[PDB]
Amino acid sequence: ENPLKRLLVPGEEWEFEVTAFYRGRQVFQQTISCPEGLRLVGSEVGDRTLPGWPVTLPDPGMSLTDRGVMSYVRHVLSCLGGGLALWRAGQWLWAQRLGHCHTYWAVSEELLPNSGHGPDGEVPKDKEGGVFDLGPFIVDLITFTEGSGRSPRYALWFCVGESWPQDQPWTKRLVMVKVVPTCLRALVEMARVGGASSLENTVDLHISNSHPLSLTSDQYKAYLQDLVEGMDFQ
């Protein structure tokens, strides 16, 4: 069968890598696998009946050093309330704002949140909003393996409590959070090493109850095509 289809099995858990930046400085990183997805919080803890594994963004610390902008960070964190939920259902990633901080998002490069022609949207409150569709990603990944397109983007970036930094250095923003579904990072890496030859390379999908796959470039491309045939497109 097609081992890549495990990505879309109802009940399957993806691993998400969450990395937080205060003023362009990495302050936190955690990898989460949970049937409920994840929920970014500032530790106003907090309603435990809220959905999602709570991912606590750290207090900036009480140093005199940098006290000004860090007090702004602390204020934003203190207003996160219920926070920012992110979870998977089907071929989609969904987000929802459960607290008071307006949050904007984009699917971007690993290292650069904003370029990017502005944000892809604002995370909604009181209902879920789709932030990522695996379907077009796989189509673009197939194109990538054929030499005909760019590396497909999979890094979700959230700007918390401020406008999206369009045409501004992203490092000026108080609270920026990157979430990478690590299966997608692995799929892109696997595509890059595929053209090395027709020997076998290993790809670790980083999903629940899954084993590292050893595949030839042909096998991999074949599985991607089969995977995309069973996915939903409008």
Binding site: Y72, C79, H102, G161, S163
Partner: peptide, 10 residues
């Protein structure tokens, strides 16, 4: 700096 926070009320 100048920070325009986008935080709603209760």
């Amino acid at each position: 700096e100048e920070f325009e926070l986008l935080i709603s009320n209760s």
